[PDB]
Amino acid sequence: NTFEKIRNQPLSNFLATSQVRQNYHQDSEAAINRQINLELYASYVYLSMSYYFDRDDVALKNFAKYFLHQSHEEREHAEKLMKLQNQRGGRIFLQDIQKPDCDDWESGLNAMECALHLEKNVNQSLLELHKLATDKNDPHLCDFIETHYLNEQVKAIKELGDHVTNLRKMGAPESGLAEYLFDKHTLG
Amino acid sequence: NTFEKIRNQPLSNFLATSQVRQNYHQDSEAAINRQINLELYASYVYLSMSYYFDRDDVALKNFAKYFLHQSHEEREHAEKLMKLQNQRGGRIFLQDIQKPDCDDWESGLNAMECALHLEKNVNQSLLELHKLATDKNDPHLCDFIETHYLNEQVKAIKELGDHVTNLRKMGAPESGLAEYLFDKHTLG
Amino acid sequence: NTFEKIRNQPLSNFLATSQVRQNYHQDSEAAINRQINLELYASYVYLSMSYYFDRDDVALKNFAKYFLHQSHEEREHAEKLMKLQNQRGGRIFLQDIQKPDCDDWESGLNAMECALHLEKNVNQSLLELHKLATDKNDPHLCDFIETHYLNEQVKAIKELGDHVTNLRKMGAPESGLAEYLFDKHTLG
Amino acid sequence: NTFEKIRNQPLSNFLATSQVRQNYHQDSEAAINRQINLELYASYVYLSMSYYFDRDDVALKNFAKYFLHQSHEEREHAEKLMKLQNQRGGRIFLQDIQKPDCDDWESGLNAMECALHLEKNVNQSLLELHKLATDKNDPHLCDFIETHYLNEQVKAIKELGDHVTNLRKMGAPESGLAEYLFDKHTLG
Amino acid sequence: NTFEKIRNQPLSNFLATSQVRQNYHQDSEAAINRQINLELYASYVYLSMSYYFDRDDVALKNFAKYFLHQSHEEREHAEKLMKLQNQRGGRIFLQDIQKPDCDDWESGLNAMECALHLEKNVNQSLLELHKLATDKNDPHLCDFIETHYLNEQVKAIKELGDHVTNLRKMGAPESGLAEYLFDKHTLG
Amino acid sequence: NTFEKIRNQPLSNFLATSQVRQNYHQDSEAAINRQINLELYASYVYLSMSYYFDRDDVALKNFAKYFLHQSHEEREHAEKLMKLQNQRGGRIFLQDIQKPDCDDWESGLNAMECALHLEKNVNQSLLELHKLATDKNDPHLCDFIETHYLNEQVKAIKELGDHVTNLRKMGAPESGLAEYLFDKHTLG
DSSP class per residue in E46-92: HHHHHHHTTSTTT--HHHHHHHHHHHHHHHHHHHHHHHHHHHTT---
Of D144, D138, D149, D183, the closest CA to residue D163 belongs to: D183
- CB atoms near residue D28 (< 10 Å): 20
E and F in touch (3+ CB pairs within 8 angstroms): no
CA dist., res. C94 & res. A136, Å (int)? 41
CA dist., res. F177 & res. F181, Å (int)? 6
Tell whether F148 is in a known binding site: no
Could you say which of D116, D131, D154 has the minimum Cβ distance to residue A87?
D154
Establish if D97 touches chain E: CB-CB under 8 angstroms: yes
Could you say which of B57, B177, B181 has the minimum Cβ distance to residue A165?
B57
Q: How far is CA F104 from CA A91, F51, F92, F164, in A?
A: 11, 11, 34, 18
Bridge partners (DSSP) of residue A97 are F97
CA dist., res. B11 & res. F166, Å (int)? 97
Taking every pair of Cα atoms in chain F, the longest distance, rounded to a whole number of angstroms, is 63
Taken as a whole, chain A contains a residue count of 188
| E59/C162 CB distance under 8 A | yes
**Angle between helix B108-134 and helix B151-170 axes, rounded to 10 deg:** 160
Q: 3-state secondary structure string, chain F?
A: CHHHHHHHCCHHHHCCCCCCCCCCCHHHHHHHHHHHHHHHHHHHHHHHHHHHCCCCCCCCHHHHHHHHHHHHHHHHHHHHHHHHHHHHCCCCCCCCECCCCCCCCCCHHHHHHHHHHHHHHHHHHHHHHHHHHHCCCCHHHHHHHHHHHHHHHHHHHHHHHHHHHHHHHHCCCCCHHHHHHHHHHCCC
- CB atoms near residue B147 (< 10 Å): 9
The answer to whether the beta carbons of residues F33 and F92 sit under 8 Å apart is yes
Q: Work out how many CB contacts closer than 8 A connect C with D.
A: 32
Establish if F44 touches chain A: CB-CB under 8 angstroms: yes
- Nearest chain A residue to C18 by CA: give it: A161
**Chain B residues lying within 8 Å of C19, measured CB to CB:** 56-57
- Nearest chain C residue to B81 by CA: give it: C51
The answer to whether the beta carbons of residues E67 and E50 sit under 8 Å apart is yes
Resolution in A: 2.0
Region of A102 on the Ramachandran plot (φ > 0 left; ψ -120 to 50 alpha; else beta): beta
Tell whether B77 is in a known binding site: yes
- CB atoms near residue C101 (< 10 Å): 11
Cβ-Cβ contacts under 8 Å for B109 (sequence gap 6 or more): B164, B167, B168, B172, B173, B179
D and A in touch (3+ CB pairs within 8 angstroms): yes
Give the type of residue at B93. F
For residue E123, the 8-state DSSP code is H
Cβ-Cβ contacts under 8 Å for A157 (sequence gap 6 or more): A116, A119, A120, A123, C20, C22
Cα–Cα–Cα angle for B45, B51, B52, rounded to 5 degrees: 85
CA dist., res. D129 & res. D144, Å (int)? 12
| B56/A178 CB distance under 8 A | no
Q: How far is C20 from chain D (nearest CA, A)?
A: 28
- CB atoms near residue C137 (< 10 Å): 13
Mutant choice from A2, A43, A47, A61 vs F, greatest count of F C-beta within 10 A: A47
| B180/A161 CB distance under 8 A | no
Report the SS3 class of residue D102: coil
Cβ-Cβ contacts under 8 Å for A175 (sequence gap 6 or more): none
Establish if A185 touches chain B: CB-CB under 8 angstroms: yes
Establish if E59 touches chain C: CB-CB under 8 angstroms: yes
E19-24 contact pairs (CB < 8 A, 24+): E19/D56, E19/D57, E19/E89, E20/D56, E20/E88, E20/E89, E21/E88, E21/E89, E21/E90, E22/E89, E23/E137, E23/E138, E24/E88, E24/E89, E24/E90, E24/E138
- CB atoms near residue A117 (< 10 Å): 12
CA dist., res. F79 & res. A64, Å (int)? 13
Cβ-Cβ contacts under 8 Å for D162 (sequence gap 6 or more): F56, F59
B and F in touch (3+ CB pairs within 8 angstroms): no
F141-149 contact pairs (CB < 8 A, 24+): F141/F28, F141/F88, F144/F84, F148/F80, F149/F77
**Chain C residues lying within 8 Å of E180, measured CB to CB:** 166, 169-170, 181
Say if residue E139 is preceded by a cis peptide, omega within 30 of 0.
Answer: no
CA dist., res. A60 & res. A154, Å (int)? 27
CA dist., res. E47 & res. E70, Å (int)? 8
Establish if B186 touches chain A: CB-CB under 8 angstroms: no
**Per-residue b/e over F145-158, b at no fewer than 16 CB within 10 Å?**
beeebeeebeebbe
**How far, rounded to the nearest angstrom, does the alpha carbon of residue B84 sit from its chain's CA centroid?**
18
Report the SS3 class of residue E131: helix
The answer to whether the beta carbons of residues B59 and A162 sit under 8 Å apart is yes
CA dist., res. B82 & res. B35, Å (int)? 10
Of B175, B57, B67, B65, the closest CA to residue B111 belongs to: B67
User: In this complex, which chains have at least 3 CB pairs below 8 Å with chain C?
Assistant: A, B, D, E
- Nearest chain A residue to F16 by CA: give it: A103
Residue C106: Cβ-neighbour burial (10 angstroms; 0-12, 13-18, 19+):
exposed
**How far, rounded to the nearest angstrom, does the alpha carbon of residue A176 sit from its chain's CA centroid?**
29
Cβ-Cβ contacts under 8 Å for E76 (sequence gap 6 or more): none
Could you say which of F57, F176, F179 has the minimum Cβ distance to residue D171?
F176
Which residues of C are known binding-site members for Fe cation?
Answer: 39, 74, 77, 119, 153
Taken as a whole, chain B contains a residue count of 188
**Per-residue b/e over B25-49, b at no fewer than 16 CB within 10 Å?**
eeebbbbbbbbbbbbbbbbbbbbbb
- CB atoms near residue B169 (< 10 Å): 9
Report the SS3 class of residue C15: coil
- Chain D (8-37) residues lying within 8 Å, Cβ to Cβ, of chain C: 19-20, 22-23
The answer to whether the beta carbons of residues E34 and E55 sit under 8 Å apart is no
**How far, rounded to the nearest angstrom, does the alpha carbon of residue D6 sit from its chain's CA centroid?**
13
| D155/A87 CB distance under 8 A | yes
Cβ-Cβ contacts under 8 Å for F135 (sequence gap 6 or more): none
Of B157, B56, B40, the closest CA to residue B92 belongs to: B40
Establish if A104 touches chain F: CB-CB under 8 angstroms: no
**Chain F residues lying within 8 Å of A83, measured CB to CB:** 51, 54
| C142/D139 CB distance under 8 A | yes
Mutant choice from A17, A18, A20 vs D, greatest count of D C-beta within 10 A: A20
Cα–Cα–Cα angle for D168, D174, D177, rounded to 5 degrees: 85
Could you say which of A165, A171, A181 has the minimum Cβ distance to residue B59?
A165
Region of A59 on the Ramachandran plot (φ > 0 left; ψ -120 to 50 alpha; else beta): left
**Chain F residues lying within 8 Å of D162, measured CB to CB:** 56, 59
Mutant choice from A54, A63, A77, A80 vs F, greatest count of F C-beta within 10 A: A54
Experimental technique used to determine this entry = cryo-EM
Of B118, B121, B147, B143, the closest CA to residue B133 belongs to: B143
Of A58, A13, A54, the closest CA to residue A31 belongs to: A13
| B176/A170 CB distance under 8 A | yes
Could you say which of A123, A134, A145 has the minimum Cβ distance to residue C22?
A123
Establish if D161 touches chain A: CB-CB under 8 angstroms: yes
Of F149, F147, F104, F143, the closest CA to residue F123 belongs to: F149
The answer to whether the beta carbons of residues A2 and A41 sit under 8 Å apart is yes
Bridge partners (DSSP) of residue E97 are D97
| A150/C139 CB distance under 8 A | yes
Establish if D57 touches chain E: CB-CB under 8 angstroms: yes
Residue C120: Cβ-neighbour burial (10 angstroms; 0-12, 13-18, 19+):
middle
Mutant choice from C17, C22, C80, C85 vs A, greatest count of A C-beta within 10 A: C22
Report the SS3 class of residue B97: strand
Establish if C80 touches chain A: CB-CB under 8 angstroms: no
Beta strands in C118-159 (DSSP E): none
For residue C147, the 8-state DSSP code is I
CA dist., res. E170 & res. E161, Å (int)? 15
- Cα torsion A124, A128, A131, A135 to 10°: value is 170
Mutant choice from D2, D50, D96 vs E, greatest count of E C-beta within 10 A: D96
Helix ranges, chain D (H): 2-7, 26-52, 61-88, 108-134, 139-145, 151-170, 176-185
The answer to whether the beta carbons of residues E85 and E33 sit under 8 Å apart is yes
Residue A75: Cβ-neighbour burial (10 angstroms; 0-12, 13-18, 19+):
buried
